[PDB]
């Protein structure tokens, strides 16, 4: 199950896995700056540090220039610099729960199913045998095109190799000639894969 969240500044997002641990798929900030133009900023690294590999986390976003309160709530804060206070501001982020965040596949002859982050650099590795891609899907549920099937591309670039690098950023930039921030900053992949022999 993927949590696709849209949150305002100030609003706390509280995540919890019934089983497994959290894996952050993407994060994007859209906010007015001091020049009253809509800017884009990153937040993936901050969310990963709070959430990845944990069964629960909680965070909220706030502005560079703020009246600083003293409160236990503050340990959950994430400051985004150039943003100025405005109702137009908004964070879109997705996480999912997985039993493991490792892409080393330990057993042969069983399907694995997992997600791959927006800017993944970690290869999928068969401990025993070689890769075989059943399905590789490019999800962008906040964009007008919500789904692209990239199975054939991943299949030709990974089948019968011991390891496979699925990098959604590189797929989009270099195979789909993608330039739109919606897709570049928020798309993530799901893969169904088996190790043979």
């Amino acid at each position, epitope marked *: 199950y993927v949590h696709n969240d849209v949150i305002k500044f100030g609003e706390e997002n509280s995540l919890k896995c019934s089983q497994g641990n959290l894996y952050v798929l993407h994060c994007e900030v859209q906010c007015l700056n001091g020049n009253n133009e809509i800017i884009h900023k990153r937040c993936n690294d901050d969310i990963e540090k709070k959430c990845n590999g944990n069964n629960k986390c909680i965070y909220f976003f706030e502005y560079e220039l703020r009246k600083k309160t003293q409160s236990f709530r503050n340990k959950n804060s994430i400051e985004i610099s150039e943003c100025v206070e405005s109702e*137009q501001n908004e964070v879109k982020t997705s996480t999912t729960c997985l039993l493991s965040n490792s892409f080393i596949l330990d057993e042969a002859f069983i399907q694995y199913f997992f997600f791959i982050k927006n800017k993944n650099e970690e290869p999928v590795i068969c401990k025993d045998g070689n890769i075989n891609i059943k399905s590789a899907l490019l999800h962008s549920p906040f964009c*007008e*095109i919500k789904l692209k099937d990239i199975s054939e591309y991943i299949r030709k670039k990974c089948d019968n190799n011991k390891e496979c690098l699925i990098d959604p950023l590189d797929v989009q930039k270099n195979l789909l*000639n993608e330039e739109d921030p*919606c*897709y570049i900053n928020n798309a993530y992949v799901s893969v169904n894969v088996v190790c043979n022999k």
Partner: antibody, heavy 121, light 108 residues
Framework: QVQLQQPGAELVKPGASVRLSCKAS????????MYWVRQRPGQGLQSIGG????????NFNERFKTKATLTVDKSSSIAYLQLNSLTSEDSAVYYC??????????????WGQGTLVTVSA | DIQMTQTTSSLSASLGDRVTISCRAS??????LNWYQQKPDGTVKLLIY???RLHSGVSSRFSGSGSGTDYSLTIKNLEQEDIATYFC?????????FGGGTKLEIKR
């Protein structure tokens, strides 16, 4: 620069059909839906529908469920609006248009010039 | 198809004035509302998307507000260049749908 190029005009006999073209350039054609919009001479904008060039899937406004057929040619980055079995009441400007950003709340920032379809003998 | 309704058909205001154009959806559209300007020559320009986000290059004289079913375009310090027809559009549920438009005339 993003460009959507449409012919100025099409003259169509009553009861015939016509295929309108929208030739896109300056961006990656498969990264956006193409939408179409009608405007009869003294009236307002009316949405026709839109197509995902990646899978050919489309949505249609109710009034155009049969009047309109959307297709694309991905190779040449051209979107087509086929208008079926026209009557004089289909005389109108037909625009192609696309969202400025790919977010699902994006507005339609780029517009073709619009083709004036005249249905007449 | 969500029905969009622009109540004022036609508006007359003086230079420098402030005008409001309203739009109402037939069901909650969760702020997914856009505004367009069509000038007399037929050219359509996006002004505002997502209720209040200004399209790139649009003057800050234009602002948008609203929630639920009810939304408003505000134009401050009216200029001559503003003679146009203004249209809203929901994109909360596809297919998108337009309001019937509001014609703006400048007094002299």
């Amino acid at each position: 620069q993003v460009q959507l190029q449409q012919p100025g005009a099409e003259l169509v006999k009553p009861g015939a059909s016509v295929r309108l073209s929208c030739k896109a350039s300056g961006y990656t054609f498969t990264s956006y839906f193409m939408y179409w919009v009608r405007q009869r001479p003294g009236q307002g904008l009316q949405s026709i529908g839109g197509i995902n060039p990646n899978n050919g899937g489309s949505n249609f406004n109710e009034r155009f469920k049969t009047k309109a057929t959307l297709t694309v040619d991905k190779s040449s980055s051209i979107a087509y609006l086929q208008l079926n079995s026209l009557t004089s009441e289909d005389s109108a400007v037909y625009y192609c248009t696309r969202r400025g950003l790919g977010y699902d709340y994006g507005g339609f920032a780029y517009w073709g010039q619009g083709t004036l379809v005249t249905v007449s003998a | 198809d969500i029905q969009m309704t622009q109540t004022t058909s036609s508006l007359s205001a003086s230079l420098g004035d402030r005008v409001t154009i309203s739009c109402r959806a037939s069901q909650d559209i969760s702020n997914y509302l856009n505004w367009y300007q069509q000038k007399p020559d037929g050219t359509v320009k996006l002004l505002i998307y997502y209720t209040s986000r200004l399209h790139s290059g649009v003057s800050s004289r234009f602002s948008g507000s609203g929630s639920g079913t009810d939304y408003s375009l505000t134009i401050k310090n009216l200029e001559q260049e503003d003679i146009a027809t203004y249209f809203c559009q929901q994109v909360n549920a596809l297919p998108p749908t337009f309001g019937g438009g509001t014609k703006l005339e400048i007094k002299r």
